[PDB]
Amino acid sequence: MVDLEQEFALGGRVLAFHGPLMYEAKILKIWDPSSKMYTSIPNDKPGGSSQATKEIKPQKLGEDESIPEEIINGKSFFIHYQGWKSSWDEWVGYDRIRAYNEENIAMKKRLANEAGSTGSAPATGGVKKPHRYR
């Protein structure tokens, strides 16, 4: 529709590309190197929260999170992976995640064709499949 869709929107969708395939995501707590601390809003209820609260004050990170120096130094987004478990509630860097827009849909649809299978085999297929790992 408009160019604005390309920007992260604090309660828009984001799509996040893991490597073989990509999934739906939804921002709520976000991060920037300018203060190396985050900010958050009541946009969901993670799998270990009563709810996210109103205009959450910046606090030092690492109460339940981890971010490598790869996404510390850049824009980052704590998200609920949609159609998926709350176990995956994590942040991604803007190298893997992007705000819901037509370019990401072209990615989505290409991958939804080339690799659109469940990965329910002893070879993982192309899916993050949490059922077992080592």
Report the alpha-carbon distance of residue 52 to residue 106 in Å, rounded.
Answer: 32
- Give residues with Cβ within 8 angstroms of 107, minimum separation 6: 15, 17, 22
Identify how the structure was determined: NMR
In the three-class reduction of DSSP (H, G, I as helix; E, B as strand; rest coil), residue 56 is classed as strand
What is the C-alpha separation between 6 and 103, in angstroms, rounded? Answer: 9
Nearest to 89 by CA among 22, 40, 9, 28: 28
What does the domain layout of the chain look like in residue ranges? 1-115
123 close to 115: Cβ distance less than 8 angstroms: no
Fold classified for 1-115: SH3 type barrels. (2.30.30)
